[PDB]
């Protein structure tokens, strides 16, 4: 039949007798009105994970079958709202009134239904867009030590999507309710709530809800992808899902493994991260992209969860605490961070300029570790150090101030060609604002030419003429 | 409809309710027994329900010693969780885990009692206003400002200065604040609680304070539930009366450890480093309740014990995501005699944003961290290459960094026995003014030994004159 | 003096070459010991976990 | 017939009961095909691989796809044999799953035969005793790291060096000159990289000479574990029936070791060192002992390997190195400088390099090339601090020789014709050995360094010099 | 068999390390408690039951003799590890082979300084 | 037994003085592994010079070892070990080379072994 009775209750898990026809992954309802998900089908008992308060469920209480898999609401109606992992509102702005509801455990797009990634996802961060480029349909991991900027890079990225036809989803996982309130308020202040959805499963919410949050985040983000529109999903900590999954598995009595995690921990993040894709023209050409975040203890890049996700994604952005406590912000280590879609996820303008940046910056990472203290060396080494110091000042940037690609390629072009050789290393930041102020008068000219033509090869004569004559006449 | 004890396994006990009317999870049970013969012993015990087993049986955790318990005794179901007295009649008292008085002043006559387990506030009714709360301590007031209405965490290993820092904060913040104060000694020394109570009695601060203990010698059941008893009392002043309140807690690690000690006996599979499979869930139910709502604010200072100076241990690592300010105490500074031993690189807060603090406060704090971070990497090299091989910019950074690191030290009022000095208070403007002269090189001539256990920067010049330089 | 300054720079060049080589050799021997410790800690930790799970 | 029923389900693991007492063998394949009876149910098309005989007429099995929607009491059928896949020439230019079903939307495969995934290896009475060198036509590999026929070769390299181009060029050369096909097994691959490979195979015309089998990362542990054995059974038919020499490519052998570790944990087996399965060396052997040079024909394999923490002593790299015959290293510095293919001449090695197998001049030319290139690597930090004019006449005479030899290792590939004007070049072992011997004696030192850059045989460098 | 009759015999084991790995596999499948590197406690008794059988007999027993040449592979060239040290404690000496000698042309690649025979010196002819 | 009450006063001073020099040389050991002994000056340099001689004079040719090396075995009385180490510590044998204290019995053997070398 479709009815059972609870036999054991504890720590957010229940065991029931009966329920002969339950399906693996189905939803079940308790006499209390609370919901649960059936995850184990033993020979004589069903193992149920509770989706609510469990201190009201007693041994001998009845449970009934709902004949349905886990399903969430989807549509444009969710834009500007705050919701829980089950698709219920949290902002207190009234009901959602959705038109359709769909499963949380859909299969990923096959190898023939995809198309190569070739269109950019501008983050507005000088170090990321130039050296570690992201394309629509890609998966880029943000990984680092605690308190290094991570939520900052994800929110600076969402703020930059105001002009483009992109929809953003933010999944708050295991986060404190007061930090979630500062994130929602920051998005409302920058006007990002016009094109974003927030899914939250905070630290006091049941382990079950904190486990279904990213899957519900993909169901909402891939809806726009199947309509031809672009979408972006962000997971603030994937390290917190692994912990929430470890609890449910060790309580259901499933065999443990490395760091007590169950054998299917690689499969958990793989089912999720392979759903980000750029589809083919037969499917409408849509695109979903993901920004998973990971927390590493004292730089343990070789721990079980960091190695699983580093192997699954199309690249990673490493943040370091010694860079952070030394003034380099955002604290991204350019030497260890890579994008495997580089040279295709960039516009022609950036590809021409970033080539020189890669060589100048690569020769600097090696040289400063040893030649920083020495008083007199060969002029080549002096010029390599002086250029590397100036380029590492151009890559520094403050929070909530993302740069449009047209402004980025202009400043990088000026630095790479070496027009800053007479400018002191402390003055480089003042030069960026002063040069961009002169360019405000030319924004009408260079915005239309760099945005439409993207031809920095033709533009060389105008950039050289303005940069040299304007500064040499004023500085002499 | 009563129950019977079936298994006694140290702290854990199993009870069977034959009628089928079983107690809910977290309910409180009573064992009151009078000895029938000369062989038996009189017993008075409380146990809380933890898990529902199959054959009309429940697992329960005892809040006191289980010695003298016999299989087949009689158990009474109270019908609700551990309910603690709440109201203004709890002020100037000291309490047990069950909210009973541990002082000899007589019974408490509070008209209401509240259960220690309550749902946390919702996202729709929280608040997050930002202002600077002064401590009078040179390091905390500059490098990691305390947010009013926010959680503060003091992290450290054994004997680094945590309790001597909590005590100085109580004698500074609470002594400069109108409103109630609450203190919970979670699994600490019963000798320290006695000295705190006497200091309060002398000063007169007990009239505005509440104390809860359940110390190291108590069983695991009491050591984890004590923090909830102190919290249900600080919540009544916020939610019912509307007043702002301070919650001070020493050793929140004992709450995590006590949960791990009982987890194996309940039947739960073990997890990483020998912790329970529910560590993050149990710390979140505690930390998510200590927040500022639309009605009133709870400012909280917590001391965290790091088992072997390794911040990567599950209990300290799980704690870091909940704080608004974190201060790390390092034995490296303590062994050099630099107290309070706060690490100037690893210490941070939600308030070190250019939009919240003054311009020079932000500049001085960022310059201190850069000079000390540069010195940290360079001092290691000097041990193998020797100080003669480094450049003039490096020598200048070494000389200034030594003086900066020593000026971070201060004599506390509670540390007179350990320091042989009376104790001093430094206001924020003097902390900023003092550190700026060292960074700008004004005092390059003053010896590095004129900054240990000093107060204001004027004293360093007077002390150098007393040293005949 | 010309020969003395040249021989001083030559002597320091050889001394620094040997010091760097001694440090590079010490780094590989320490790296191998750290890898042995890393693998030993992981097998010990996983066996304490499985022993506890088997007991329960 | 005989039929079982599902009795337990938890993640990828499923348990089945056979009430009549007729039970399936330890590696048989079982099918679950069910049509929803009521609106509450879901239709399913799953398959399971047997793992253990538990007792009381029950068997434990690993799942090849998702187990969501399954119900206890659902009937199941035994196929009477292991997983079976199509074999023959009809599998050339097509895409497949672990089960042998096609991924391509190119209709069904009507192959004349189907072979089981689990087959015993060839015995000592069926092998070839004297080793042969497989001519790749690539100067660097054929000269400094010879490939044994029937051997296992290991690929170690960083991102952005040109691994795919080399695979594609190796896949070509064996089909054109040796008249032999190739097979590619993507063990737990990223479905976005599988897409780029299929399109570049299609644009280069290479698909008609190769078979591609993909096990994606989004698949359960059981499916990612067996994908190498279905790629191998397809390569086995070309050796046993057609008698041809074959190339088998495995993108990452570490993902095969990892998938077995996850399947062992799910089955409940006590872990070994670093948490790997107790059967790690027997699982690696049952794969690697089927890749051999028999008397009829041979299967050679190029396998890439991921080192878990830059530690070669980890149990997965350790058990694989026991079976390998050669090592090929790909470096980013050669790619940044402009040398293609980007193969490191001082870190790549093979067991075939001894003078008892290679000719005396082949050994001498390889030893002299390594000695000159090693000596030049020493001078590089001296050249960074001081000028070229200051070096001794003998030192300069070695720096010049080394740069020209390093450039003569470079070769214009045939697969590269879409990205550059260079047509492509195949260089026999006898021609590359002859060419480097002339360079080492200084016969061509009065020639520009650009004459040796991106060229094939030595006579082409002479004509390129005459054109300038 | 040859040794009991009176004839001399030699035995070679191509890898004792592979033998130990094959034993760790069945002990862990039988669910026996693991030790130092997941190997069971019986790992010393394993190599001891076999190596002790090699022996030179007394004239009363017919004077025959069995001799053994066990082989061990060691990761990164360090002698101080569980299986290597177990067999070094059982044998009558050891011959050390080094990789830098082998890849530099010195063959056979035997370390003359650290290799020793404990029974040696008495078994050599006077010449 | 290494307590002032059980051993002779001369034995106790010599044994304690030997462990101090051996501990001091184990502290210098981690820095000389990189820089070598060219940087060391005065007492730290003199301490390694005596510590080398002391570490070698603790080596002894055994009677059971005659089957491994052609050297005859030796038995050294307590009065001879105390006198030999005392003279090494005091510096009376600072002129003798460090290679003259390898596998010897008594201190007089080091004097003739040095005389055999002639260095
Ligand atoms: N570019 C920047 N300039 C100045 N300060 C910065 C910059 N980027 C990050 N920070 C600061 O560093 C901290 C980074 O906080 P963030 O939330 O991004 O870190 P996190 O890794 O996500 O921390 P957590 O794990 O607690 O969530 C904040 O104090 C932030 O204001
Ligand atoms: N400000 C200070 N001035 C001088 N000495 C101090 C100071 N702070 C701490 N100490 C010294 O360090 C010791 C640290 O004891 P403390 O009670 O603070 O340990 P703790 O860090 O709190 O450890 P625990 O939490 O386990 O009690 C003191 O007893 C005293 O000797
Ligand atoms: Mg964050
Ligand atoms: Mg304390």
Author numbering:
A (entry chain A): 26 to 501
B (entry chain D): 2 to 470
C (entry chain G): 232 to 287
D (entry chain E): 1 to 468
E (entry chain B): 248 to 374
F (entry chain F): 352 to 470
Recite the paper's sentences:
The minimal subunit composition of F1, acting as the ATP‐driven motor, is α3β3γ1, with the γ subunit embedded inside a hetero‐hexameric stator ring consisting of alternating α and β subunits. F1 is the membrane‐protruding portion and rotates the inner rotor complex against the catalytic stator ring during ATP hydrolysis. Here, we used ancestral sequence reconstruction to infer the catalytic β and non‐catalytic α subunits of a putative ancestral F1‐ATPase. To reinforce the structural integrity, TF1 was used as scaffold to accommodate the functionally crucial core domains of α anc and β anc ; nucleotide‐binding domain (NDB) and C‐terminal domain (CTD) of α anc and β anc were genetically fused with the N‐terminal domain (NTD) of TF1 that forms the stable hexameric scaffold (residues α1‐94 and β1‐78 in TF1).
Under this condition, five distinct Cryo‐EM maps were obtained: two fully assembled F1 complexes with different γ‐subunit rotational angles, a hexameric ring lacking the central shaft, and we also partially assembled complexes (a tetramer with the central shaft and a tetramer without it). The resolutions of the cryo‐EM maps were determined to be 2.5 Å for the two fully assembled complexes, 2.8 Å for the hexameric ring without the shaft, 2.5 Å for the tetramer with the shaft, and 2.7 Å for the tetramer without the shaft, using the “gold standard” method. The rotational angle difference of the γ subunit between the binding dwell and catalytic dwell in F1 anc_core was approximately 34°, smaller than that of TF1 (Sobti et al., 2021) (~44°). Regarding the catalytic dwell, all structural analyses of extant species to date have consistently observed the catalytic dwell structure. Based on this result, we assigned the three shared dwell points, seen with both ATP and ATPγS, to the binding dwell, whereas the dwell points observed exclusively under ATPγS were identified as the catalytic dwells. The analysis of the angular differences of the binding dwell from the catalytic dwell revealed a histogram centered at 32.1°. This angular difference aligns closely with the rotational angle difference of ~34° between the binding and catalytic dwells of the γ subunit observed in Cryo‐EM structural analyses, supporting the above assignment. Thus, F1 anc_core essentially follows a reaction scheme similar to that of TF1, featuring two stable conformational states (binding dwell and catalytic dwell), even though the binding dwell of F1 anc_core is significantly longer than its catalytic dwell.
